[PDB]
TrEMBL record:
Statement: the UniProt record of this protein carries the keyword Disulfide bond: no
GO biological process, one term: DNA-templated transcription
Domain Influenza RNA polymerase PB2 sixth intervals: 281-425
A single GO molecular function term of this UniProt record: RNA-directed RNA polymerase activity
Location(s) in or outside the cell: Virion; Host nucleus; Host mitochondrion
Gene (name only): PB2
Protein name: Polymerase basic protein 2
Role played: Plays an essential role in transcription initiation and cap-stealing mechanism, in which cellular capped pre-mRNAs are used to generate primers for viral transcription. Recognizes and binds the 7-methylguanosine-containing cap of the target pre-RNA which is subsequently cleaved after 10-13 nucleotides by the viral protein PA. Plays a role in the initiation of the viral genome replication and modulates the activity of the ribonucleoprotein (RNP) complex.
Site positions for Mammalian adaptation: 377
Family indicated by similarity: Belongs to the influenza viruses PB2 family.
Length: 425
């Protein structure tokens, strides 16, 4: 068991899951990236089949491949393992303190859980829309507070629902609505003042180990939030991993065999580590990961590598070449006002090249072929340059001759892109 492999697998899995959510078919995209990614020179799919690491993004990728994962679920970034009791679901409408209706499954029954996070751990005891007890420990008061918030929302208590202020319209990267329980999570994670204010306070017995925490997140030996105790000693976070068969849908929601959602992209951490082992993504969907600059380098690199393939497709079947998925990373950098505008001008420049027969440039085709990917509109033509938006600044590529973005030295026969090299012919 290597820590560097585990750490790097998690980073690779998160990046792929985040990118996959924006796709039209997130599951198929995620599998494509998993099969075209290597970590420490080993294929990611081989690592996933051999690695026991349980983490949300990793387990989403494992699920995609039909592998077993932990039976536990993720909620608010905490791993929830049910240690006792059970519940049944009753679908209900509840009114927030903004009078927004939320359709939720109220869980009926008594249950006990451990909650395991990176900076905090807790035992949660709970009944129908009621938090009975929360024993929590963590690195600092802010980390304890994160766990408190999640448990309050998970409880589904009335006073939590009524503590909502303003409207809940949180969305993911694909502009899809978060589900109601995640609407509540994101809301109170942003600001828990009203939640903690309305929750209630109680006096506590001065027990050895246990202390209180107040609405302002400061500790107290005298009183605490209702049901909440802070363990000075860290709460026991160990258990044996029980792996089970799971299913997964188009949008990367992973379910156990009872149909309960264990994981989704909403449960994947936003934190970005620096990998200890080299991760190499070969998919074009991942060219964005190193910024807008590497997307240009990679786009032109890919054209030069597969030029004998592109040169055959360019003459015969041009519509198949324009509708490649490899030019979509380039098209995102092109300003939205001029995507169909340049797609006409450049597609007509290739039409004159085929019709006149003796105007085949090669350097002009590779330089401009990414602009022809969008749906074409009519063109005024005679453009001095074509703008491509990098980090804030809109650096432009000239039609004839070189530029800062595209610098082809004719003597060297090597293409440079924003300083860095990008293949050769
Ligand atoms: C409030 N919850 C939420 N929950 C589980 O947490 C996971 C994520 O909940 P969610 O984001 O509301 O998804 P959803 O599909 O709506 O969950 P549900 O199963 O409640 O319909 C699900 O597996 C859900 O069953 C719970 N599981 C148990 N055992 N007891 C509970 O009180 C609750």
């Amino acid at each position: 068991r290597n820590d560097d492999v585990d750490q790097s697998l998690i980073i690779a899995a998160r990046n792929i899951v985040r990118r996959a959510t924006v796709s039209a078919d997130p599951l198929a995209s995620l599998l494509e990236m998993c099969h075209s990614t290597q970590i420490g020179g080993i294929r990611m799919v081989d690592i996933l089949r051999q690695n026991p690491t349980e983490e949300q993004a990793v387990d989403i990728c494992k699920a995609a491949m039909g592998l077993r994962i932990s039976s536990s679920f993720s909620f608010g970034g905490f791993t929830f393992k049910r240690t006792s009791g059970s519940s049944v679901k009753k679908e209900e409408e509840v009114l927030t303190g903004n009078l927004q209706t939320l359709k939720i499954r109220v869980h009926e029954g008594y249950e006990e859980f451990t909650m395991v996070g990176r900076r905090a751990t807790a035992i949660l005891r709970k009944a129908t829309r009621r938090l009975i007890q929360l024993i929590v420990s963590g690195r600092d008061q802010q980390s304890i507070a994160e766990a408190i918030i999640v448990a309050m929302v998970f409880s589904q208590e009335d006073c939590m629902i009524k503590a909502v202020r303003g409207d809940l319209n949180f969305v993911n990267r694909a502009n899809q609505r978060l589900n109601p329980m995640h609407q509540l999570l994101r809301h109170f994670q942003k600001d828990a003042k009203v939640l903690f204010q309305n929750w209630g306070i109680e006096p506590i017995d001065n027990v050895m180990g246990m202390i209180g925490i107040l609405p302002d997140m400061t500790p107290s030996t005298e009183m605490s939030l209702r049901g909440v105790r802070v363990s000075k000693m860290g709460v026991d976070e160990y258990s044996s991993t029980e792996r089970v068969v799971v299913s997964i849908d188009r949008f990367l929601r992973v379910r156990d065999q009872r149909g309960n959602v264990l994981l989704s992209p909403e449960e994947v951490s936003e934190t970005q580590g620096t990998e200890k082992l080299t991760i190499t993504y070969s998919s074009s969907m991942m060219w964005e990961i190193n910024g807008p600059e590497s997307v240009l380098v990679n786009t032109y690199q890919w054209i030069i590598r597969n030029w004998e393939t592109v040169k055959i497709q360019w003459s015969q079947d041009p519509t198949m070449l324009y509708n490649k998925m490899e030019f979509e990373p380039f098209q995102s950098l092109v300003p939205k006002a001029a995507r169909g505008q340049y797609s006409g001008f450049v597609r007509t420049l290739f039409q004159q090249m085929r019709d006149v027969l003796g105007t085949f440039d090669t350097v002009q085709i590779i330089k401009l072929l990414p602009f022809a990917a969008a749906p074409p509109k009519q063109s005024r033509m005679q453009f001095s340059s074509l703008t491509v938006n990098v980090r804030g600044s809109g650096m432009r590529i000239l039609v004839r001759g070189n530029s800062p973005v595209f610098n082809y030295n004719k003597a060297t026969k090597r293409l440079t892109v924003l300083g860095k090299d990008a293949g050769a012919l």
